Amino acid sequence: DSSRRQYQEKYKQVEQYMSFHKLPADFRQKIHDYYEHRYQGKMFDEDSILGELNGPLREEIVNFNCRKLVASMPLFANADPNFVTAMLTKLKFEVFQPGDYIIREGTIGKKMYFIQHGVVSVLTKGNKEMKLSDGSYFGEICLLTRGRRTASVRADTYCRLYSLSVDNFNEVLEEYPMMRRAFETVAIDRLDRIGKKNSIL
Amino acid sequence: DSSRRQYQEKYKQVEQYMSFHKLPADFRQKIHDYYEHRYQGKMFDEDSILGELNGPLREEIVNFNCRKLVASMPLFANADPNFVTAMLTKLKFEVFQPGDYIIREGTIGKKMYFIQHGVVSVLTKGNKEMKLSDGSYFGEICLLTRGRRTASVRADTYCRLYSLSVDNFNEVLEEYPMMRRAFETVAIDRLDRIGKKNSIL
Amino acid sequence: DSSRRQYQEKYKQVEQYMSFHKLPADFRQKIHDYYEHRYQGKMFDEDSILGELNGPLREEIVNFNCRKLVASMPLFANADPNFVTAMLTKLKFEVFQPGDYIIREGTIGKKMYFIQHGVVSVLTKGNKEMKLSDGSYFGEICLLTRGRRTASVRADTYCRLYSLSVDNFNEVLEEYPMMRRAFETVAIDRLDRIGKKNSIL
Amino acid sequence: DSSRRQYQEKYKQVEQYMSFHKLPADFRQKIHDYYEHRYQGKMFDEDSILGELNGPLREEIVNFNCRKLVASMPLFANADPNFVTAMLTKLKFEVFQPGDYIIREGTIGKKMYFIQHGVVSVLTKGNKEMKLSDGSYFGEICLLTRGRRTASVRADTYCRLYSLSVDNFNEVLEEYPMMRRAFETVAIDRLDRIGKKNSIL
Ligand SMILES: Nc1ncc2ncn([C@@H]3O[C@@H]4COP(=O)(O)O[C@H]4[C@H]3O)c2n1
Ligand SMILES: Nc1ncc2ncn([C@@H]3O[C@@H]4COP(=O)(O)O[C@H]4[C@H]3O)c2n1
């Protein structure tokens, strides 16, 4: 009701904004498609909503909502549930469209991404062309080294992702420094298979 | 009027959110029950409201609202009224349900809690099983030592609590360092009766 | 229209809040009176409003609104108009009721106050009983020394004041350190006539 | 619809605010004119709007909206598109009226300005009287030296500008320190032709 009415009303304002700025018809369609995928006809102020509840219910809700994400990703599946919960409560849902460059090589990285659904392509000068899909994550290397991105990552399909900011990543690893090692091992494995070696891990 | 209408409208959005995420019927009931207890059919933007007033009226209102809390808790009852007021204006009302773990042992603590109404259980590896009830507080030990929580605390009944963040606790003790001692003495007493000794107090 | 309707609607929510907390009839009247004095039947989101404009119009508006304040107070009347403007744009309007203690001796001070209209009483252990009225200011001593308040200040009548936070005071004196001296001289004069001497000025 | 209704409604609140403060008729007209120029009958919460989208669409939208600004200004036209995008996403649209002093000499500078449309006059004690117009920028010297403004800049016509804060300027030059040199060269050229020499560039 108010959730479906909010979607319509908010989308209307998007239409008037695009009209005001005279965006072309293809660009408008693209934005429309993204809106459909990202919100699916409803809008919630999830912040305000979760902010009315308490810690325990928020945590119970986030665990319920991400059951498949958690169970399909060994890093989350085998870890301390308190660590899992601390990660989940800071994740932000994002949708990307095919061809979008989620991450650009060389740039400075402020987030990593957990793939709920979709396929992306890790691209590099080298020619290394590796896919990643449901149950994996990426963008973690630059958060561990605080270097620049080691590759570009491009959306092949529509991608439903959950992002985690560099600040929250670090706040979580402060409390659970055990799990930093689990990220570094895979990060090393991955760099290894694109002729890279970082002494920082 | 607008306060009762706000509750209904806000709860409706909660229902649509739960529906959207397909939460089970028991979880929905649990969230409904919490809402009833936490808001009791009305919603106020207490922030905005208090922000329209001045310092003196805010302080007069918070003292009126917490008269029983203040008078039933010797730490507040016997102290400097300016200290009391400074604590009260920073307290945040929270409701917990039976079985909820308000605090987990070993974790890092960012708040303590004053019990307006309810019973909680301080749980520890040891086997020490102590209850606390109306007029007491907990969660203070980790704010004084900045260690990890010394025990878990679990709600036995519905609990009406007022929380105080670690930042506000410290801002208040900066202005009134006299009262830090009053927290440390009880903290020592409590650690003593669970075979703990911290040299930090 | 929407400004008068906002006042009514906002006051209604205040009434429901007071009712919810069961405040006594005298306290309710007091809050009602304050509301009348503070808002005079209208409410504006002056922030949002001024935020739609630019720097030059904001500055022109604040100067227009405070013409009598500026012209009646020699510190503002004789100074650099850019300094005046920088002070004015950071001032916050506040109303106090008779008997209110605006400032308490011994406490830590985070603001000073410019009197638009009203009489206050500077009170001290000593017995020094000095009035201040339209065109003067107070609360500046603790901002210059960062000590504790040197006296208590109490509202004799309804007081229309403009407050300035310690952060903004300092940001303004950074840009115009010339004017710090003008505050210190009066501050010294005032301390002198209550048997105080601070070497910090 | 809601965008045109928002403009009207917001302007109405401006009228009631001006009425409340008893602004004169000329000042009211001036504010009305600014509103027309600045919003052109529509209001969007561009923040909220762009915040519903993702990084790639925001970036695509900002590039589309500023095509003429980017293509007419060699600094942007010939640079790395990622640098351009990083600048554009932080720019804030502002409108100034004829006679307005956008920048005052001697003051401390917290922003620079890119001229979308309009003519301004760089004024100095000296007597140097230089115009700048569509496709140029100003206010950059104080951001590079962190001194005081080297001149005053005054609007000759209505000016459509995009401002960039000192914090964002620096965050962008951190990532692309190559382009600081491009600002310094012009800054030196400009100081040279008003008998100034700063060793800081
Ligand atoms: N699967 C795979 N293989 C080799 C790789 N080299 C880099 N990456 C991912 O691309 C990412 C590019 O961003 P980042 O360097 O922050 O983290 C990098 C890794 O997640 C790789 N991913
Ligand atoms: N009553 C009681 N007795 C022994 C205790 N040992 C610890 N606590 C409380 O449990 C709390 C667990 O969180 P914390 O360690 O921050 O503060 C601790 C105390 O408030 C105790 N409370």
Ligand SMILES: Nc1ncc2ncn([C@@H]3O[C@@H]4COP(=O)(O)O[C@H]4[C@H]3O)c2n1
């Ligand atoms: N008029 C007057 N005379 C002696 C005073 N001694 C202190 N004050 C004011 O009371 C104020 C109490 O707060 P503060 O010490 O921050 O600044 C102090 C002065 O403005 C005095 N005001």
Ligand SMILES: Nc1ncc2ncn([C@@H]3O[C@@H]4COP(=O)(O)O[C@H]4[C@H]3O)c2n1
């Ligand atoms: N065109 C031109 N010529 C000489 C100049 N000397 C200073 N400026 C501009 O005026 C500006 C005044 O603000 P700022 O000193 O921060 O940057 C300065 C320059 O953009 C000048 N602009």
